[PDB]
Design a binder for this molecule. Sequence first.
Ligand SMILES: *[C@@H]1O[C@H](CO)[C@@H](O)[C@H](O)[C@H]1NC(C)=O
Lengths: 220, 211
Amino acid sequence: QEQLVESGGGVVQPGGSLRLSCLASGFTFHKYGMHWVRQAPGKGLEWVALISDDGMRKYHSDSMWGRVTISRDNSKNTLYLQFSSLKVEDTAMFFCAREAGGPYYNYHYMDVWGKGTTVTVSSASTKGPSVFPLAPSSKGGTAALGCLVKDYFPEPVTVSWNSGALTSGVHTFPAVLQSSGLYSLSSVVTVPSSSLGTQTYICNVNHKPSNTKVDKRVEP
Amino acid sequence: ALTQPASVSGSPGQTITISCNGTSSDVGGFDSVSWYQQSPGKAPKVMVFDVSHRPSGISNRFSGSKSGNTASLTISGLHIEDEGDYFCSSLTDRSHRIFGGGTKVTVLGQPKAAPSVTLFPPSSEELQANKATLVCLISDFYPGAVTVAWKADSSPVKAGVETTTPSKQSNNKYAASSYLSLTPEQWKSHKSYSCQVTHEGSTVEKTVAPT
Ligand SMILES: *[C@@H]1O[C@H](CO)[C@@H](O)[C@H](O)[C@H]1NC(C)=O
């Protein structure tokens, strides 16, 4: 049946170039236009390019600023997307999609999608995190304090509190990819204000990749 | 980008509608509006095309419409299996395609829950390391859809904002986090910095100050 599989993603360096590929099957490739659609992490779908059945006509998004070139090889039943001057803000998943059509006229919607390939653009190797304490502010009833675990690459980093002896009231959030190409994440614990200055709140951060373990006391 | 509501929610069986406000160069200039459903960790799926048409083998409880420059997607008798993100898309004047920003559809299964909001200022340790970051934490809300708007003093702010996608806590409610990246000089320059989370109509706000 009708299928597309994207491949060629992975981690790439800013300023560098890259070529993604979509391999088709289950339908007569050379009869359909093909698009690329991208999706940055947690944002919307976003159109990138369309190429005609015979590959002699290309259309690109004006907001790619000419950095992407779509192409295809109908002998290989394969579609391609090429970059140059990659940027961190290019980080996204990349979906290949078919332009629905028939007696062929293009019908103006995408009826076949691959499970895309992910492109992560970062200039970093294995960066261990900085851990800054989010101290409890002047309140009191309930106190919220935490640890800010930023500037690290790659994912993931794991976080416990008081060496796992503290578990109730812990919200460890998912990681954001910053403008820099590095990740930040946060962990808060909700504790009684009365326990400040008598309990000790330390957060234990392990970044397996850069083999960095760190404990930070969070105090008022 | 065509404009969709960040979030629309309905209970099972109920009938719900997602709007797609465009311009006369796209939605209004053609009859080539399609809608895609993307479920958690999947590749999008065509639901509607040419405004109101449904592909072979797609539930009749999905229907599309258009008035002027806005299209609509209607889902009558919501099922749980419908939850996901939905995008409108249109042909344009320049023979390009364009998508809407998307709408998270939730099928309510528990009572509404307002988000608890906490906002931390830059730590001292970060400022000395010549950096600054406001961290706005959000938890305990249902449905799991929030809009996070930042403001320096009274005026809006879009540069340096990074917001996560809500995830399910162990209490089956949702949490998200939002970071505003500053320079030590920007932080010090302003009087305050509010972080406003809007959830199902209501808006909780928290505020922090330099000294
Ligand atoms: C989209 O809706 C807004 C009002 O909510 C309006 O400004 C705009 O004209 C609408 N588009 C049309 C023509 O339906």
